[PDB]
Design a protein around this ligand. Structure first.
Ligand SMILES: *Sc1cc(Cl)c(Cl)cc1C(=O)NCCO
Length: 350
């Protein structure tokens, strides 16, 4: 019985993807020698199994490299040697993924998994296939693309507090379309904290904060005036600022135009990419609880805005109801829950 060799690559292959290790296996014998070098002669790190049967690379293989693999097997039957050479994928472009929320964070019940690429993704299905989301307790979720670069994953309903979420973006070696390959892999983990839902009801002009179902704060508010109203819908809480300059040019609106503005405010909590915040508004305290005066943001008192800053976290929820506005776009960036579940579940990988 002459020993046989079985490699995970074929001699002469090209376009070999680097998303998996390269292996050599011996049958009816054992591996006496296995080496693999790149085109600069640099040895590739590997490991031989204690039983001598299975050898495998132990470091990532490179893009745009030619590798030469030599292997010898020995056995009572005799010996066998093979030499194999192959070339790995040569990307036309690289894209790097960025994942939110941050590793180890505790977030609110409305926080989606977010995978943002720094380039347009031509094969959204390949990107989705490369992303593994683990949930404990397990829950059904689905992917939906907000734009050509960023995909989101969430359940049908708000997360259950206490849920562990693990995200593995294994895009290295993956053809994401049109010669674009993943620049690296990413791996993050987060946990769902307490349920915090704040409701701004235009009929009362009160922003009511509920923690685990209990009213803990009631904030008089002034929202957008009729000509620049606050959109109804579900908003996800994002970033927090002790102070920030609100500049309309950020959104293509010249500061000196009718709806333009440039002002510094305190205690600002972001709730939409379109620039809606909860923030301190000393100048509208008389209107708070009575009339809408803003350009769309939720004006509250300095003390209530700081309380909001101190007690609300990324992924908590603000829901606005009964304004004269429309509904916040589902693809805003923090408007994901406004997409109906059936549409989100069906996705848009194309
Ligand atoms: S959030 C905000 C704060 C202030 Cl002080 C002004 Cl003048 C405008 C805005 C704003 O409208 N941002 C855009 C979202 O409507």
């Amino acid at each position: 019985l002459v020993p046989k060799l079985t490699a995970s690559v074929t001699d002469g292959a090209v376009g070999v993807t680097v998303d998996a290790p390269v292996s050599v296996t011996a049958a009816d014998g054992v591996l006496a020698a296995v080496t693999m070098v790149n085109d600069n002669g640099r040895p590739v790190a590997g490991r031989l199994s204690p039983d001598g049967l299975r050898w495998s690379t132990t470091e990532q293989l490179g893009y745009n490299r030619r590798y030469t693999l030599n292997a010898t097997a020995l056995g009572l039957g005799g010996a066998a040697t093979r030499q194999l050479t192959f070339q790995t994928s040569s990307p036309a472009h690289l894209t790097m993924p960025y994942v939110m929320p941050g590793d180890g964070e505790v977030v609110g019940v409305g926080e989606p998994v977010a995978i943002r690429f720094d380039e347009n993704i031509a094969d959204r299905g390949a990107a989705e296939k490369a992303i593994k989301i683990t949930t404990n307790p397990p829950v059904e979720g689905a992917f939906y693309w907000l734009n050509n670069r960023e995909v989101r994953w969430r359940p049908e309903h708000f997360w259950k507090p206490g849920t562990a979420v693990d995200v593995a973006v294994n895009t290295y070696g993956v053809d994401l379309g049109e010669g674009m390959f993943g620049e690296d892999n990413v791996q993050t983990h987060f946990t769902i904290g307490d349920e915090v839902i704040a409701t701004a009801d235009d009929n009362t002009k009160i922003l009511t904060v509920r923690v685990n179902g209990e009213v803990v704060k009631s904030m008089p508010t002034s929202m957008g005036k009729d000509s620049t109203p606050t959109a109804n819908g579900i908003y996800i809480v994002g970033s927090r600022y002790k102070h920030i300059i609100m500049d309309s040019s950020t959104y293509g609106v010249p500061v000196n135009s009718p709806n333009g503005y440039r002002t510094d405010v305190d205690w600002a909590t972001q709730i939409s990419y379109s620039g809606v915040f909860v923030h301190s508004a000393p100048w509208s305290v008389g209107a708070q609880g009575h009339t809408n005066t803003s350009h769309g943001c939720l004006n509250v008192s300095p003390s209530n805005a700081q309380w909001f800053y101190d007690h609300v976290k990324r992924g908590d929820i603000v829901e606005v109801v009964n304004t004269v506005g429309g509904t916040l776009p589902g693809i805003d960036g923090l408007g994901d829950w406004n997409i109906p579940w059936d549409q989100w579940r069906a996705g848009n990988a194309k």
